Fold Polyprotein.
Amino acid sequence: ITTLGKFGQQSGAIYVGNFRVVNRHLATHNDWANLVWEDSSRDLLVSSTTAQGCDTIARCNCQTGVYYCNSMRKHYPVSFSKPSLIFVEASEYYPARYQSHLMLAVGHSEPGDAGGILRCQHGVVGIVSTGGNGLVGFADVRDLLWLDD
Ligand SMILES: [Cl-]
Ligand SMILES: [Cl-]
Ligand SMILES: [Cl-]
Ligand SMILES: [Cl-]
Ligand SMILES: [Zn+2]
């Protein structure tokens, strides 16, 4: 799989409390100026917002949910792995390396699909980060208890 990037004017973001959660590879100058936390190994960055967001972070162990696929302009039901340490090929965004806290699924993804939200009954689970060959990989956020406190 490889890191996908984002095509189109859609946010690719979770807005919870006074945080914005994005793929690290899509973080803006404003994100880095308002940095709270980032981890390259997870492809995650969190910045601070003035506006209150409405997202709820799931605190479950669900392995089924629904994600948004930008390339197909559709939501899909999906079955995804536990957060895992997966090998990710080189791209414009990272050299080849192991990416942690990544959940793999059989599901459509193309370049430009990063930032699509994965959600379950409990709330937001994660965001598309990687994919290829009929697989999609989601960066989990559910372990970050300080997002929703
Ligand atoms: Cl890294
Ligand atoms: Cl489940
Ligand atoms: Cl969505
Ligand atoms: Cl591939
Ligand atoms: Zn859940």
Q: What stands out?
A: Residues 58, 60, 62, 120-122 surround zinc ion (ligand 5) (CB under 6 Å). The chain has two domains: 13-54, 56-140. Residues 84 and 101 are 5 Å apart (CA to CA).
